[PDB]
Write a protein that binds this ligand. Structure first.
Ligand SMILES: O=c1ccn([C@@H]2O[C@H](COP(=O)(O)OP(=O)(O)O)[C@@H](O)[C@H]2O)c(=O)[nH]1
Ligand SMILES: O=c1ccn([C@@H]2O[C@H](COP(=O)(O)OP(=O)(O)O)[C@@H](O)[C@H]2O)c(=O)[nH]1
Ligand SMILES: [Mn+2]
Ligand SMILES: [Mn+2]
Lengths: 263, 263
């Protein structure tokens, strides 16, 4: 419980750090009894690292790992995601026996400590290619062996998508066809994209959401929020604004719970 | 080899009948040893029913079942899909021990007779909400009981999406959490939408595709094809055209095998 198990996130800059701060605050809001840890890289300002230390039990400094895999990253219109190979450092955290990695663009809506009943590698399906798991939420076991194996495969073969999700799916390739218990229910990693892609399903299953994941190039922190009206201002033709409940929650927590700690 | 087992499709009009014909032609092309069955409703022309008899072993006339659920259908911008409850008639086919239902907008790329090793209900995940199965390819056991249960649920509750897929997911509730063997690999029902949603995944898994599913409002038969050049004429800004190989194959089979029976 308290000592040997953690939620782990990652930030390589101050932008994704506002995400990590909101994630962290949401985990506390829902009364986790596990540690909170964030992996941070040198591009995170000293000032931000100090703020991160008020929310996370530990801020762990690591080196950026970058795929440099511009062809594969362009293939999915995510030229900026090569630095997500930095996620692989999560397996080096052998101070813990089991952890849940969560993307810095996630938000917790309910206690999810029952994830620690799972075993490596448990993750939810990805809505793009559902025989791949989405790497935004996964339950794993820190291991120097698994760490080095993952580093080796990344250096030798890279990632089919140029980020962490490809390589993690290739390494944990039995996921689609194994033990159904290793398929986390989709409500533990609810892709913002699924809300508009199959709204009828969201309408009957979404009230049970435990985690929302703002996956895709547009992040909550790239909107403009007016605290007085609670209005979110978006770019034109944004399909996520037809169901904005999770975006508003994100901003509520940031303005209320994170903002006071920033100053 | 199975005289007591069939593939089953559905058509309510002459337009999806072109799809059924191409699907049936593709099952023959890949040497199925099973029977081929199409459910058709009164709106299919007499001349079309006769053409369907050259491809399918059985053309079975059934009444249209229509949810009339404009609210849920409109939720997913598919106002025409209420007649998909007609699919429920497939459970009445107790001449067969086991069947694979396939949507009329599917296209077989390899022999898939190994699907008959599965048991009801086996289906692939839906890319919008992957804890629901897509109802375009599924293995089931004809049964008067299951048939009547499904009709009663449709009459009482309707479908959460106004079509067959919602009601079938509600009825086969345990799919997301049961027996992984009942999760068909995504290659047995490859959603055309998944090609452009996670292109990197397509690039490394796509060569293994056994079935493609042209799901969504635009169907292969709504394009304009030039057989001289083998170019497909699309509506503007069509995302599927960046990877057109499956559409081209649909039109080749249509033009070579099917259109001669029509025009
Ligand atoms: O510039 C970046 C890009 C990503 N990340 C980390 O890598 C994760 C995966 O990236 P993202 O969530 O943007 O991928 P997606 O969920 O959109 O596929 C993020 O949540 C962050 O934890 C980061 O720290 N800096
Ligand atoms: O007007 C219609 C619409 C649907 N269908 C049948 O119902 C299936 C499901 O509809 P569709 O494939 O359009 O749904 P999607 O796969 O796009 O969700 C089709 O493949 C056909 O077999 C039909 O016969 N007539
Ligand atoms: Mn993410
Ligand atoms: Mn279909």
């Amino acid at each position: 419980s308290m000592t040997d198990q953690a939620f782990v996130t990652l930030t390589t800059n101050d932008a994704y750090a506002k995400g990590a701060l909101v994630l962290g605050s949401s985990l506390k809001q829902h009364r986790t009894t596990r540690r909170l840890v964030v992996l941070a890289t040198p591009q995170v300002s000293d000032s931000m690292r100090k703020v991160l230390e008020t929310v996370f039990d530990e801020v762990i400094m690591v080196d950026v790992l970058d795929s440099g895999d511009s062809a594969h990253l362009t293939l999915m219109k995510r030229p900026e995601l090569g630095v997500t190979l930095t996620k692989l450092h999560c397996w080096s955290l052998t101070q813990y026996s089991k952890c849940v990695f969560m993307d810095a663009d996630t938000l917790v809506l309910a206690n999810i400590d029952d994830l620690f009943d799972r075993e490596e590698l448990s993750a939810a399906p990805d809505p793009g290619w559902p025989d791949c798991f989405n790497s935004g939420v996964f339950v794993y076991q820190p291991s120097v062996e698994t760490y080095n194996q993952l580093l080796h495969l990344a250096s030798e073969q890279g990632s089919f998508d140029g980020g962490d999700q490809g390589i993690l799916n290739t390494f944990f390739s039995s996921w689609a066809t194994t033990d159904i218990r290793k398929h986390l229910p989709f409500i533990y990693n609810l892709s913002s994209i699924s809300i508009y892609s199959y709204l009828p399903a969201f309408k009957v299953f979404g009230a049970s959401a435990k985690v929302v994941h703002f996956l895709g190039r547009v992040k909550p922190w790239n909107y403009t929020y007016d605290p007085k009206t609670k209005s979110v201002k978006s770019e034109a033709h944004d399909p996520n604004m037809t169901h904005p409940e999770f975006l508003i929650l994100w901003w509520n927590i940031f303005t209320t719970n994170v903002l006071p700690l920033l100053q």
